[PDB]
Amino acid sequence: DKLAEVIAKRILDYFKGEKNRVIRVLDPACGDGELLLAINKVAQSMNIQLELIGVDFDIDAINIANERLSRSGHKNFRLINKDFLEMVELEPVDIIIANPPYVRTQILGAEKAQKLREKFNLKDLYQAFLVAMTQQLKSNGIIGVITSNRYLTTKGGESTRKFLVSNFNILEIMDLGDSKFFVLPAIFFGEKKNNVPKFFKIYEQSDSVNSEFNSLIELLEVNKSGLYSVEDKTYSISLGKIISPENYKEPWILATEDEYEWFMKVNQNAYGFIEDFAHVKVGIKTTADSVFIRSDWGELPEEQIPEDKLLRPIISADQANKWSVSLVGNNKKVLYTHEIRDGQIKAINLEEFPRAKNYLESHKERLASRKYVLKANRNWYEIWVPHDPSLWDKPKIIFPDTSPEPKFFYEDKGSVVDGNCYWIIPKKENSNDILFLIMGICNSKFMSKYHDIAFQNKLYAGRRRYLTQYVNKYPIPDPESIYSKEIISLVRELVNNKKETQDINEIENRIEKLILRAFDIESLK
């Protein structure tokens, strides 16, 4: 049994179109016709009539494909000796089964680079080939494409992931791994857009092994995960889901059935999400940090020490800690250049702060050399992104953008938040108590597990990215629940009371169990 037949069987089973008509199948790089012969053989087993269209450069491959297609008794086939990218008359097809050739990256001529940019609305020969296949496919058509599996996880595959999830309802991704079928191949099954996608994964495991199957090919149709042996080699097969592929900046990894079920249960038992209760905001960008953010303001010449009102405490990611941070002994302050004047966010008048004026004018060359500031009709001395001066005084949660563990802490000293941190304030009509609940959730192993499943797994890079797109979608339990009330009470204790590590861990243990009760979920793993 050929690998192409397992692809053919999956493609035809996924095809939701009418089965009593002629199905048009395109192989843009048919070669010797391995894929076209396979899909026709499976179609004959299901009494499906196919029109096989094969396109490939090099007559020698086309000639071999021509004699093999004719010998099968199938007469409704058509071979085009041409490059598919240069070719794109060919009507739209129902099915594309493909093994594209373009593997090595190369520089393209400027004439070919531009001709491919405009014709496929690009911003890579592999990208154009992928777009060329999609445009030739009918809406709700099925595609089965063999690629390397590198685009699933690497940053190089971001644009490939974006294109696929934008144009296709992903049906199934098969990660063939280290299995030596032919490179590390992956098979993509997609329905062209006019479904939680399945994820198949098979890898050789070296160190209840089911030895029932006699061939490696039969393993590709197993509907249950586990260890399987066909010879001296034992294979680990994982059937799962791919959750939120639209988040294409993160790798496309398999979620186990248990992880997906737990993920769905948390979502259905959730009372709401962080965005329903609070604003998740980003810190400031001064653009000249060495001028605006210092901890030696008192050591400047007296005529240059900015007036006290302008020096606000500023918190950066390196200071992040769970629950609370000690600001005593910390002199890191930002010269904050904005205020609320006449109900409007305006830059300060330097003439009102002569000492800050002396300091800033001593740095006027660097500050005025910021073209984007002057081009925006803004003053040379301004912090580029100062946000809202009136919001810093509110109690807030602060967390770093990247962290190997959750470091969400409460802050109520009117501190400004730097650019490598985000911060959370409640939407009006919600008490300040909601911040303690949110923090208890955010810092938990529960939400770390949820984050790994829903948005991106820490295991890939060893850190978690707390993007606002992720934190906004953190599930929150019923704040009026007796369990949420106890979480709030315990978190308020961790914030306001200096405690030893032994009972901080105890309180944190209580919060973990309370979150389970608040979501009505028994355990994590």
Residue closest to 172 by CA, chosen among 12, 14, 1, 6: 14
101: its two tokens? 């050739």
Q: Parallel, antiparallel, or unpaired for β 278-282 and 421-426?
A: antiparallel
Contacts of 471 by beta carbon, 8 Å cutoff, 6+ apart:
274, 280, 399, 422, 424, 442
What is the rounded distance in angstroms from the CA atom of residue 477 to the CA atom of residue 492?
Answer: 17
319: its two tokens? 């200071």
What is the rounded distance in angstroms from the CA atom of residue 117 to the CA atom of residue 111?
Answer: 10
Resolution value in angstroms: 2.5
Chain centroid to CA 497: 38
What is the rounded distance in angstroms from the CA atom of residue 163 to the CA atom of residue 132?
Answer: 12
262 burial class (0-12, 13-18, 19+ CB within 10 angstroms)? buried
What is the rounded distance in angstroms from the CA atom of residue 364 to the CA atom of residue 357?
Answer: 10
What is the rounded distance in angstroms from the CA atom of residue 40 to the CA atom of residue 45?
Answer: 9
Whole-angstrom CA distances from 369 to 287, 294, 467 are 11, 20, 31
Instruction: Confirm if 97 and 12 have CB atoms less than 8 A apart.
Output: no
Instruction: Confirm if 43 and 50 have CB atoms less than 8 A apart.
Output: yes
What is the rounded distance in angstroms from the CA atom of residue 78 to the CA atom of residue 55?
Answer: 9
Dihedral sign, Cα of residue 67, residue 68, residue 72, residue 74: negative
Instruction: Confirm if 131 and 96 have CB atoms less than 8 A apart.
Output: no
Rounded to 5°, the CA angle 20-26-27 comes to 135
**Terminal CA-CA length for the chain:** 38
Domain ranges of the chain: 3-201+239-253, 277-519
Q: What are residue 333's DSSP bridge partners? A: 294, 313
Q: Parallel, antiparallel, or unpaired for β 323-324 and 338-341?
A: unpaired
What is the rounded distance in angstroms from the CA atom of residue 438 to the CA atom of residue 491?
Answer: 10
Residue closest to 347 by CA, chosen among 293, 384, 372: 384
Residue closest to 173 by CA, chosen among 129, 239, 99, 262: 239
Task: Select from 2.60.120.10, 3.50.50.60, 3.40.50.150, 3.60.60.10 the CATH code of 3-201+239-253.
Answer: 3.40.50.150
Q: What is the DSSP string of 89-155?
A: ----EEEEEE-----S--PPPHHHHHHHHHHTT---HHHHHHHHHHHHEEEEEEEEEEEEGGGGTSG
Residue closest to 428 by CA, chosen among 280, 282, 278, 271: 278
Place of tokens 């803004």: 378
